[PDB]
Structure 1
Amino acid sequence: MLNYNAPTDGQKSSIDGANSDQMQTFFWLKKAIITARKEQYFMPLASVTNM
């Protein structure tokens, strides 16, 4: 029978021979995870003097 088996972990599919292997084995979201800024407390307190 033609089986998918598990192309990852070293068990090639039935359709694939000795030379071939699956091209796509995962899906990629393309939306990354990011971290925002840390809030600041002392900075708004200050006033500015020109020089």
Structure 2
Amino acid sequence: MLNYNAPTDGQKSSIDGANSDQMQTFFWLKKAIITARKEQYFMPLASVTNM
């Protein structure tokens, strides 16, 4: 049988020889996770006096 086995965790597929492994073994979203800016409360209560 041409079993798939598990290329990761060190168990090569049947079809592969002794030199080659699977090229793609995971899918990548390409969108990252980001964090928002913290709010500012004391900044609005300030009026500038240009020098």
Q: Same fold (TM over 0.5)?
A: yes
Q: TM-score, normalised by structure 1?
A: 0.96
Gaps of 5+ in 2: none
User: How many residues matched?
Assistant: 51
Gaps of 5+ in 1: none
Q: Percent identity?
A: 100
- Cα deviation, residue 19, structure 1: 0.9
Superposition misfits of 4+ residues, deviation over 2 angstroms: none
Higher helix share: 1
Q: TM-score, normalised by structure 2?
A: 0.96
Distance in 1 (CA, whole Å) between partners of 2:50 and 2:11 is 71
Distance in 1 (CA, whole Å) between partners of 2:27 and 2:13 is 19
